[PDB]
Amino acid sequence: QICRIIVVRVCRPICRITVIRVCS
DSSP states (O other), rough: OEEEEEEEEESSEEEEEEEEEOOO
């Protein structure tokens, strides 16, 4: 019905910034 976007941090190698989409 509705979707949103989020963010996280992955250390590969250094903990960088990345956005992650989702749907529910």
